[PDB]
Amino acid sequence: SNAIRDISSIELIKEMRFGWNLGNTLDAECTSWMDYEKNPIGSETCWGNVKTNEDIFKTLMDNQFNVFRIPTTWTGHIGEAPEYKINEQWMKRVHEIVDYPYKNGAFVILNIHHETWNHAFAETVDEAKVELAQVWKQIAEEFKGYGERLIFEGQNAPRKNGTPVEWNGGDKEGWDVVNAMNAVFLETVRSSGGNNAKRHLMIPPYAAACNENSFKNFDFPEDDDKVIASVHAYSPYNFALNNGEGAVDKFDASGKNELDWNINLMKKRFVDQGIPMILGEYGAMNRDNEEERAAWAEYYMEKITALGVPQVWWDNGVFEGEGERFGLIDRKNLKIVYPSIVAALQKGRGLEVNVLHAIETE
Ligand SMILES: OC[C@H]1O[C@@H](O[C@H]2[C@H](O)[C@@H](O)[C@H](O[C@H]3[C@H](O)[C@@H](O)[C@H](O)O[C@@H]3CO)O[C@@H]2CO)[C@H](O)[C@@H](O)[C@@H]1O
């Protein structure tokens, strides 16, 4: 089945309800202690998530999720330079997981994620561009026959890791590198075989940041209507993403102001300019505050739905402890842990509320 619809991204995006990330899974990176030679697909579970199965996705699809992002870290599974051959058992497992939502008719986003080699520094950009082309040549070849519901996202949050400008929008060095890398990704996939000339491709601004500086220095192609801007927006910060000092457990007036500001940024940079965009990651972590988060999620969803922009929940499988607690589905037991959040996504999207597989009330 190698058919692909010839459809613009803006038209295709209309078919998207809302999404879910298979977080802390194929993106988990454990090369400091795991032997990837003896465990070539072991990294999937090395951050504590269960082995992925189709029923995780069917549980979510029952709740009207129809976009599934598969964040994938290829670092550790890549052969030596300059061929950068991807381990074939790893590629097969990535392929099995893409197929869980894809063969059930949903949208799938496959990316490159926690890579050590695509950092946004001019020092290494010549080498990083070669590795990016080699990696995407192989991904594009493996999935060349897939239709329009399989989307490639060329980079995740390329940035100047470990610098003062890592998380505040970047600087000119970082913007030029991210743009050059995005161009290599687009060219590599467009130049490849099969349906890839008509595949929908996502590219991020620097760090995928919802930021004035990142947005303003983001190059976007003017002659390719099947390219999509990839943005991440865990907004407002202290309520949604702050895992240290200053975190708040209520979505208050100042938090709404901050969220409204960033949504308006997306409107002015992308929506008003006819640039297709997807919020590929967002979420608010568990602070024993499900109703605060449900109200925030319904408001966020309603506002971006009025702009035609879909969003994709970041679910890293973590519910308690010191880590970031973005879990939404209990993958082991196939239960929605926060049913009022899922109800908020449905209601805010304009859908009928029907939360299936909810956990019992304790
Ligand atoms: O517990 C296992 C490891 O967790 C690592 O933290 C991860 C968070 O749990 C996860 O929520 C976060 O998700 C990122 C996403 O990958 C990224 O694309 C986006 O820019 O931000 C999201 C929210 O922060 O990923 C991190 C990994 O970077 C710990 O860092 C690690 O020590 C620990 O072993």
Numbering used by the authors: -2 to 359
What does the published report state?
Attempts to crystallize the CelD active catalytic domain with cellobiose or cellotriose substrates were unsuccessful using both soaking and co-crystallization approaches. After introducing the inactivating E154A mutation to the active site of a single CelD catalytic domain, we were able to obtain high-quality crystals of the E154A-cellotriose complex. The unliganded structures of the wild-type catalytic domain and its inactive E154A mutant in complex with cellotriose were determined by molecular replacement and refined to 2.5 Å and 1.8 Å resolution, respectively. Superposition of two structures solved in this work confirms that the carboxylate OE1 and OE2 oxygens of the catalytic acid/base glutamate point towards the O1 atom of the − 1 glucopyranose unit at 1.5 Å and 1.7 Å, respectively, and the carboxylate oxygen of the complementary nucleophile glutamate forms a hydrogen bond with the anomeric C1 carbon of the same saccharide unit at 3.1 Å. Meanwhile, the nucleophile Glu278 is sandwiched between two conserved Arg66 and Tyr231 residues which form hydrogen bonds to the carboxylate oxygens and appear to serve a supportive role to stabilize this Glu residue throughout catalysis as observed for other GH5 enzymes. We found 8 ordered water molecules making multiple hydrogen bonds with both the protein moiety and the cellotriose molecule in the ligand-bound structure; two of them are located near the anomeric carbon of the − 1 saccharide moiety. One of these water molecules may participate in the catalytic mechanism of the CelD as a nucleophilic attack on the glycosyl-enzyme intermediate.
Here, we report the structure and kinetic rate parameters for a glycoside hydrolase (GH) family 5 subfamily 4 enzyme (CelD) from Piromyces finnis, a modular, cellulosome-incorporated endoglucanase that possesses three GH5 domains followed by two C-terminal fungal dockerin domains (double dockerin). In this study, we characterized, at the structural and functional levels, the CelD enzyme from the anaerobic fungus Piromyces finnis. This fungal enzyme belongs to the glycoside hydrolase (GH) family 5 subfamily 4 of cellulases and acts strictly as an endo-β-1,4-glucanase (EC 3.2.1.4) with confirmed activity against carboxymethylcellulose (CMC), mixed linkage glucan (MLG), and xyloglucan. The CelD catalytic domain displays strong structural similarity to GH clan A, a group of 28 unique GH families exhibiting a (β/α)8–barrel fold in structure, with the highest sequence similarity to proteins from GH5 subfamily 4 (GH5_4), a family of enzymes that predominantly display endoglucanase activity (EC 3.2.1.4). Like other GH5 enzymes, CelD contains two invariant catalytic glutamate residues, the acid/base Glu154 and the nucleophile Glu278.
